Amino acid sequence: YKSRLYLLWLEQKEITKQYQTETDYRYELKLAHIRYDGTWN
């Protein structure tokens, strides 16, 4: 993107849903890019 390396990945977190106790999943997208010095942002 715009001549820099970026990467996207998606993480799932276990979350229980309220009279019923059930395991359910919530998903979130995450982005990172590489700084000039070589460190990932």
């Binding site: 700084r35 010095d37 460190t39 990932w40």
Partner: protein
């Protein structure tokens, strides 16, 4: 005369030694120690 010559030889063994030492200012190893500290000094970025 030979006494003076032996003193000349000694003095010149010294000039040759400090010459060769001054000529290699920073030894391969020494430069490596310095550049190691340089590397450790960096990377504030990553830990931030």
């Amino acid at each position: 005369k030979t006494v003076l010559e032996k003193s000349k030889a000694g003095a010149q063994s010294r000039f040759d030694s400090y010459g060769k030492l001054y000529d290699e200012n920073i030894n391969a190893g020494e430069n490596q120690a310095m550049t190691l500290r340089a590397s450790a000094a960096g990377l504030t970025t990553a830990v931030q």
